[PDB]
Amino acid sequence: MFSRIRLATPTDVPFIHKLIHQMAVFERLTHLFVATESGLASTLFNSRPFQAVTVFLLEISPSPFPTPDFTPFLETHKVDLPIEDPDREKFLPDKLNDVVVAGFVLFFPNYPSFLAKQGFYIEDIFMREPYRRKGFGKLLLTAVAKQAVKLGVGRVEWIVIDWNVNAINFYEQMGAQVFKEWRLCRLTGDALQAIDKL
Amino acid sequence: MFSRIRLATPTDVPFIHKLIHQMAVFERLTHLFVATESGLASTLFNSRPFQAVTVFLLEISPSPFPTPDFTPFLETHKVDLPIEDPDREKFLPDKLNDVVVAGFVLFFPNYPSFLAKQGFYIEDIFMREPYRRKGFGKLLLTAVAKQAVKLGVGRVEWIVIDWNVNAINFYEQMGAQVFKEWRLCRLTGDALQAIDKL
Ligand SMILES: CC(=O)SCCNC(=O)CCNC(=O)[C@H](O)C(C)(C)COP(=O)(O)OP(=O)(O)OC[C@H]1O[C@@H](n2cnc3c(N)ncnc32)[C@H](O)[C@@H]1OP(=O)(O)O
Ligand SMILES: CC(=O)SCCNC(=O)CCNC(=O)[C@H](O)C(C)(C)COP(=O)(O)OP(=O)(O)OC[C@H]1O[C@@H](n2cnc3c(N)ncnc32)[C@H](O)[C@@H]1OP(=O)(O)O
Ligand SMILES: [Ca+2]
Numbered sequence: 001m002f003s004r005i006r007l008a009t010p011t012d013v014p015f016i017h018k019l020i021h022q023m024a025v026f027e028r029l030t031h032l033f034v035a036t037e038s039g040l041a042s043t044l045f046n047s048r049p050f051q052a053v054t055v056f057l058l059e060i061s062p063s064p065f066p067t068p069d070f071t072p073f074l075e076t077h078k079v080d081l082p083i084e085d086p087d088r089e090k091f092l093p094d095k096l097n098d099v100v101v102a103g104f105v106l107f108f109p110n111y112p113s114f115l116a117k118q119g120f121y122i123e124d125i126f127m128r129e130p131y132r133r134k135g136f137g138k139l140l141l142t143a144v145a146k147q148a149v150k151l152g153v154g155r156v157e158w159i160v161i162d163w164n165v166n167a168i169n170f171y172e173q174m175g176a177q178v179f180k181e182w183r184l185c186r187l188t189g190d191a192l193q194a195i196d197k198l
Numbered sequence: 199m200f201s202r203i204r205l206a207t208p209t210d211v212p213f214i215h216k217l218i219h220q221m222a223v224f225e226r227l228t229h230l231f232v233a234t235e236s237g238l239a240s241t242l243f244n245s246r247p248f249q250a251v252t253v254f255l256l257e258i259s260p261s262p263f264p265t266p267d268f269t270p271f272l273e274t275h276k277v278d279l280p281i282e283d284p285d286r287e288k289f290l291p292d293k294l295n296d297v298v299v300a301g302f303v304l305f306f307p308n309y310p311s312f313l314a315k316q317g318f319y320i321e322d323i324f325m326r327e328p329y330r331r332k333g334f335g336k337l338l339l340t341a342v343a344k345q346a347v348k349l350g351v352g353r354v355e356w357i358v359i360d361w362n363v364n365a366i367n368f369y370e371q372m373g374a375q376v377f378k379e380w381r382l383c384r385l386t387g388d389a390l391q392a393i394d395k396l
């Protein structure tokens with residue numbers, strides 16, 4: 001079984017939208033979800049890949065995939081027993097070919113200022129449920145890491161909520177340092193508007 | 199006293215460099231500090247202000263300051279006592295004017311994907327020690343917030359380490375939500391290089 005990691009283009013926004021929604025449901029944050037296709041198309045592609053928000057999609061096929069600062073990551077391995085994907089038809093870029101979008105990673109440049117250089121921050125990493133625990137999720141993280149090297153990015157960072165012990169353990173196994181003694185701070189859209197009123 | 203918040207340009211790199219170093223010393227992370235003037239100049243200005251890494255400087259004068267997309271935030275207040283700055287001469291953009299760089303805030307676009315829209319992430323906010331607890335630090339945070347509104351950015355976020363009770367309390371008082379149940383994750387430059395091999 002074969003996989004491909006590629007940059008997302010505007011025609012992928014339906015898939016991104018659906019993946020983000022699935023993530024919100026999984027994380028119990030559906031009430032915060034206001035994203036739309038028009039919204040995503042309106043904001044995801046205002047800069048070059050890797051200059052700002054950037055998305056890799058991971059696609060799977062039983063067949064080999066046929067062939068700017070980027071070439072798609074190809075990889076192949078075995079899976080023990082057959083995948084059962086109820087949402088398969090919702091994740092088909094081209095309805096002819098047996099290529100399914102199984103997950104994504106959404107990231108952007110951050111700036112660890114002690115290094116005086118850009119890093120990458122991973123906002124989202126998500127494998128659809130039928131495709132978890134088969135070695136695909138590590139390919140997504142590895143893709144971001146390898147890309148970072150290719151562009152001389154110094155560091156890759158993200159956060160995780162401590163109820164998500166499975167993701168914590170995944171990250172540990174991937175060789176990530178995990179620092180619990182940080183707190184996430186936020187001025188919401190409403191907090192900002194209130195501050196603006198001064 | 200009079201204050202001004204403005205965008206940093208390349209000629210400010212010495213001040214930024216020194217402020218970052220002061221922050222590293224304060225945070226007990228000097229061993230991670232590898233930033234140089236050439237490094238900062240090489241990375242801080244490869245994109246338009248607000249498209250990527252962006253820096254505001256806060257400057258203070260006993261005299262009023264000189265009369266697209268950004269205009270400097272001016273403000274005037276009173277200080278209970280005269281300020282004693284031992285490093286004054288290291289933070290003078292011009293030398294003609296009695297204008298001193300007292301702090302900065304370094305931030306960039308993030309992407310809260312449930313909003314399908316950019317936010318701002320504040321990496322660093324720092325007032326030099328002579329200038330703390332006099333109402334200047336809030337002007338820095340307010341500048342980022344007001345700018346976010348002006349550009350229709352949805353959210354402003356950052357993290358804080360839980361030994362830093364003073365900063366935690368500052369943020370709370372500024373109306374920020376503070377979520378302790380998150381952990382910071384990191385693949386270092388060495389972790390990446392290791393992932394790149396094999
Ligand atoms: C909240 C935030 O800000 S960040 C986190 C965002 N949310 C998430 O990522 C969780 C969403 N739910 C999911 O299940 C995620 O899609 C995933 C990525 C964790 C799914 O798992 P995958 O990534 O496919 O795991 P993958 O198989 O690549 O794991 C790589 C290897 O690490 C190891 N590993 C995986 N999970 C674990 C675990 N829980 N404990 C220990 N080792 C593990 C295994 O050796 C695995 O190889 P395997 O295929 O033989 O199991
Ligand atoms: C994202 C990051 O970089 S996080 C970690 C680094 N950030 C830091 O803030 C730590 C660096 N060390 C410092 O001392 C910082 O320069 C600062 C920002 C805390 C300096 O303080 P300032 O920001 O100048 O404080 P400022 O005078 O603006 O305070 C504004 C209001 O906030 C509140 N406040 C300020 N400090 C505190 C405090 N220690 N406890 C409670 N409330 C406070 C008060 O209401 C204050 O008004 P008041 O003094 O009349 O009560
Ligand atoms: Ca996320």
Ligand SMILES: [Ca+2]
Nearest residue numbers: 113321322323
């Ligand atoms: Ca910082």
Ligand SMILES: [Ca+2]
Nearest residue numbers: 180182378380
């Ligand atoms: Ca924590």
